[PDB]
């Protein structure tokens, strides 16, 4: 078993974390367990504070910050967990003083936007930062020599049981009925659309347009909704004034073509990595009390132009490892 670690400049304190990928189960988020090794040679008026910051960038704004005092340990505190904070303490059996945090169940996941032609040090998005620093008091200024900062992210995977089969139909009017293969799709799976356009009018369908669209609601941006097409399909299929057309199509979203677009959401990046399109956000029971970050959803579109359109929702996320 391997464990991640990081140290401050001047080598005074060091922070250990077992992973920087915390799965957010739909019922309870995973906890963050870390161990701090420090040497109090003359730390008479010095205390160790470990913080967990969830911030939204553009200047930045945070809605969940916390502070945990590791040394001197607070009396009547909780027991450390045996998964990490027992083996780590056994290895550093001299001054290993642990810390722990718990994440509220309704915090947004780590999703970053695509910057495009301009760089601002770090791209827009939501990121979780773990900052551990020694200081005389919590309210006083601390400089980079005394602070350890490590970036983590929160993710969630696909549900085990698939949902109902998506389908949507609309309307001597013409009738169009569409369907997908299944409810949940992965990041490389081809999204097939079943199409049937029975006609009774004299207006013939000229061109069938199908696209996959990514919806990213930003609550902090005055509840703005930005949608972009991540897939495009154009087969130029026409039907007779009053005929019956049934066909299967195929689409596959990918980042290579969408790199040109700006403001498009991507998965959490540790440092300037390449990541897939942002996964869907699973909201617990529809209680939309989260007002911090961004939520991503995907809906397929099927459009017909005469000489009407239906939208089919689905989810796009990785399977459980």
């Amino acid at each position, epitope marked *: 078993t391997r464990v991640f670690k990081k140290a401050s400049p001047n080598g005074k304190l060091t922070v250990y974390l077992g992973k920087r990928d915390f799965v957010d189960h739909i019922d309870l988020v995973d906890p963050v367990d870390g161990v701090v090794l420090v040497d109090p040679e003359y730390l008479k008026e010095r205390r160790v504070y470990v913080t967990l910051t969830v911030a939204f960038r553009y200047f930045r704004k945070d809605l969940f910050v916390a502070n945990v005092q590791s040394f001197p340990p607070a009396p009547c505190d909780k027991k450390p967990l045996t998964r990490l904070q027992e083996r780590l303490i056994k290895k550093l059996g001299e001054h290993a003083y642990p810390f722990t945090f718990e994440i509220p169940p309704n915090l947004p996941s780590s999703v970053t936007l695509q910057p495009g032609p301009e760089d601002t040090g770090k791209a827009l998005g939501v990121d979780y930062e773990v900052k551990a620093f020694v200081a005389e008091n919590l309210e006083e200024k601390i400089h980079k020599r005394n602070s350890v900062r490590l970036v983590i992210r929160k993710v969630q995977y696909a549900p085990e049981r698939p949902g109902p089969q998506p389908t949507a139909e609309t309307t001597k009017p013409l009738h169009l009925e569409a369907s997908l293969d299944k409810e949940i799709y992965y*990041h*490389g*799976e*081809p999204i097939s659309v079943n199409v049937h356009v029975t006609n009774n009018t004299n207006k013939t369908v000229k061109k069938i347009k199908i696209s996959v669209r990514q919806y990213a609601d930003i609550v902090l941006f005055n509840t703005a909704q930005y949608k972009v097409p991540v897939a495009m399909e154009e087969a130029d299929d026409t039907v007779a004034p009053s005929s019956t057309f049934s066909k299967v199509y195929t689409l*596959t979203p*990918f*980042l*290579a073509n969408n790199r040109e677009k700006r403001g498009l959401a991507l998965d959490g990046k540790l440092k300037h990595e390449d990541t*897939n399109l942002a996964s869907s956000t699973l909201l617990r029971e529809g209680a939309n009390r989260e007002i911090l970050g961004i939520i991503v959803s995907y809906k397929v579109k099927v459009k017909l132009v005469v000489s009407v359109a239906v939208e089919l929702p689905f989810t796009l996320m*990785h399977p459980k490892p």
Partner: antibody
Amino acid sequence: VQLVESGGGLVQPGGSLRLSCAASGFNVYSSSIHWVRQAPGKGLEWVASISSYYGYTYYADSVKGRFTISADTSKNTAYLQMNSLRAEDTAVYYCARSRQFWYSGLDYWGQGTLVT
Amino acid sequence: IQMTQSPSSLSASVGDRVTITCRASQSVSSAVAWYQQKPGKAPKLLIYSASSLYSGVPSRFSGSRSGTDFTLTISSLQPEDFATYYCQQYKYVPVTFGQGTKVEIK
């Protein structure tokens, strides 16, 4: 499910060639296609690789100046145009697949077509 | 990054412990895979990652990592594992393979 390479050649030193690799069973955006080259009696030397989801390609040092890799998204096939020389005129070129997301190890392999 | 592997090793028909090591010249964070190539056939992936098996591989095969040192182990050698094994690292873009260790029957 499986990979089949339909390529092959017999080239005088300093010409051109073309390798094709048909893949049936998995998509080309959910997987990464690599070409591995085994000289007779020598180890497996890595050659051009393509990640169609991102669109960029890596090249070996000995092939960076001559080889060119491409993929056909319409039929799930990988193309490896060559301008081989004497040093590459004895090897057997494989076509193996790796998972696109969170893996780079190669799980499915082709039979391999000799190039000379 | 030069990945080095131990030379060919003998063996016995009756199952016995066989350890094959691959010494990485540069540190790789447990991103190492092991293969098996019988003569005249394509290599077969054996290990997903150091100490992690692959779907369909029997339970005898095992792996381990000791810093920059990796190891492949077989708990019991039946006469079907007599092939050659390659150690590969997939951390850096210039992917390299080991020289390959050929197991033989005595």
